[model samples]
Target: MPEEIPDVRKSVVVAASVEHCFEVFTSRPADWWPPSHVLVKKERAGLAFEPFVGGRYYEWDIDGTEIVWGRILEWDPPHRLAMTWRIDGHWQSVPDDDRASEIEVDFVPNGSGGTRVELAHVKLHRHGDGAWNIHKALDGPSPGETLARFANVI
Candidate 1:
């Protein structure tokens, strides 16, 4: 049986300022993101988040291997970034599936030098039941949790 489609929305409030939060979230993905989730093997390899619509969210391995994970669907600095999240793996291996959903992240300023980061993983059905199940298994303790933990560290 096919699993029900899920619309996942998660939010975290960081103690850092909005600009700080934006810079850290976009630029320092290697530092704050879980190592297991990285695309490159080197600890210091650079990742790029081109801040414009249709720009790329990409990374390069130390061996000069480049991977373009997705494109920027929307980019409004210090406020919002929406990007397509179609990476090759469990998320996009399903045959005849529509691999065109997105992850939308919003950074809203909260008083007292804090920022509220909101994340929405949308269009779950596009990937079919298999991909939905994979995401369901990761719902509780995946990147969402990692992002929360990162908020604390920052």
Candidate 2:
């Protein structure tokens, strides 16, 4: 069963097993991310996500400068994961435990050897006054676009 949150949510079907789908999304996120979503300075070495509880999800510039996007809260492989999504109003990395929101991902086994990868980014209210505007953006088509792209990569 799934409950709808008041924030962003996007799901896509991938032509791979749940394990493969989860691995691609969590371990190799940078390889599938579009230029439109690249936040780090292009002085950016690259982006990388660590798939473990309390591990970091972030980007690094050419200078090896690390900008932490968030920390993982849950790390159930081939099934689900949850993490802090701390991109601030000014589009900066601000991974404060008490101030950030959350992004939860679920990998459901779909058709033969396929997976339904669902992503829900909720808890926008914790971001303070201008939270609604950011919530609007997150809950829009842009996330869908990214999910579609992710399916292709998988």
Candidate 3:
């Protein structure tokens, strides 16, 4: 069943405080997010996560249209955040959270005045039959490229 899918977890340490790490991750996502990971037909102009649960984490195209990537499920500033991952296993958009996976991130202070940010993509099986594709593609070791880009921006 959907519950059998594994999670994809990755983490990285950055030379920034917990608050700053969270801010850069959520408020300034466009800087770190991969350009290829877009849904709109046009070029993506920017990305943002609305600062509250139920708000959307989305991208805006050069044409000024916006596409919702997911809905913010949790928004505990500087500590934790969770959102629905609306892109299905086929890399196509899903209209609602019912068929979506979930991404959760935690930002914790390291002893050296930096932050260790952990990210996990869970519930992939919710995408149904193509769930294993998501797991197989992401089931690798940490210091992932996404987090590496994020670390570079910090």
Candidate 4:
């Protein structure tokens, strides 16, 4: 028998250069991320992915509040990024759970200057109330869809 899975995966194609897509995806997350779905306030929020293995995946608010959302598990520019996600209500809070389950992204160059962005959010069972709710909220036209739409705008 196959092992059961608790998380969800999503993928979308972006009609933009791979490097451009990667840049937008990593550096300009605040610009494209769904404001309504995120915890950080729109005007005060800033997102950054330190471009290196073991780098910090963090967010900051205008009030100088910082949240260490995740840690980079793998870093390959314009190609792939694997990071351990541990939001307050998720894997981060699980007492005995290893905060090692990750979110992996693969930026496949589709040729013609476009790219295919694949996003996977795994290990849902370890998430807390807020994290579970957030994941649940992403069941449809939420942040994930917003991200797909943002890819087009970029």
Q: Candidate 1 at 15: error in angstroms?
A: 1.1
TM-score of 4: 0.67
Cα lDDT of model 4 by residue, 38-145, tens digit: 432334377766667766656665654656655657778557767665455431323223534667877777777788877787775564435445433223343445
Q: For candidate 3, lDDT tens digit of each residue in 1-154?
A: 2325667687877788888875675776664454333222344477766576756666665664556655667778557767666644444345565676668877788766688778787766566675645433323223344555556667
Measured against the true structure, the TM-scores of the candidates, in listed sequence, are 0.64, 0.64, 0.64, 0.67
Off by over 4 Å in 2: 1-6, 35-44, 62-64, 88-95, 128-144
RMSD of each: 5.7, 5.8, 5.8, 5.6
Q: lDDT of each structure? A: 0.59, 0.60, 0.61, 0.58
Q: Which one wins on lDDT?
A: 3
For candidate 1, the TM-score is 0.64
By TM-score, the best candidate is 4
Runs of candidate 1 with Cα error greater than 4 angstroms are 1-5, 35-44, 61-64, 90-98, 128-144
Residue 78 in model 2: shift from native, Å?
5.9
Q: Candidate 3 — which pairs collide? A: none
